[PDB]
Amino acid sequence: LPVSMTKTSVDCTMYICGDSTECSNLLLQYGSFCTQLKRALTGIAVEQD
Amino acid sequence: EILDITPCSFGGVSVITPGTNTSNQVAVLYQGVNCTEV
Ligand SMILES: *[C@@H]1O[C@H](CO)[C@@H](O)[C@H](O)[C@H]1NC(C)=O
Numbered sequence: 387l388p389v390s391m392t393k394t395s396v397d398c399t400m401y402i403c404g405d406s407t408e409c410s411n412l413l414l415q416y417g418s419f420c421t422q423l424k425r426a427l428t429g430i431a432v433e434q435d
Numbered sequence: 436e437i438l439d440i441t442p443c444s445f446g447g448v449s450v451i452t453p454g455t456n457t458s459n460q461v462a463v464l465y466q467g468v469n470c471t472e473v
């Protein structure tokens with residue numbers, strides 16, 4: 387029976403932009419889209435432990 | 436001559452704080468990097 391998973395953390399600025407500074411100014415125009423993802427990933431990581 | 440490239444040093448930065456009510460001392464934690472690199 388599986389009880390745990392892989393604690394995966396996804397960086398939005400490294401996944402979407404990666405190495406572009408011009409696109410980094412456009413991510414702040416959408417609001418807290420990255421905050422919800424980071425909070426969900428942190429919650430999953432805490433739930434696994 | 437073939438030169439192998441490697442991405443820059445990056446990772447998650449987490450601040451280990453015991454709460455602002457007790458003390459203001461904090462500790463940084465650089466995830467996924469060695470101590471020889473900043
Ligand atoms: C610390 O917690 C106590 C009890 O909850 C509270 O009375 C006090 O105001 C808090 N201190 C700060 C700086 O928030």
Ligand SMILES: *[C@@H]1O[C@H](CO)[C@@H](O)[C@H](O)[C@H]1NC(C)=O
Nearest residue numbers: 465466467468469470471472
């Ligand atoms: C950091 O570098 C040292 C020296 O090469 C190595 O022994 C150690 O395993 C490295 N740390 C990690 C987490 O791999």
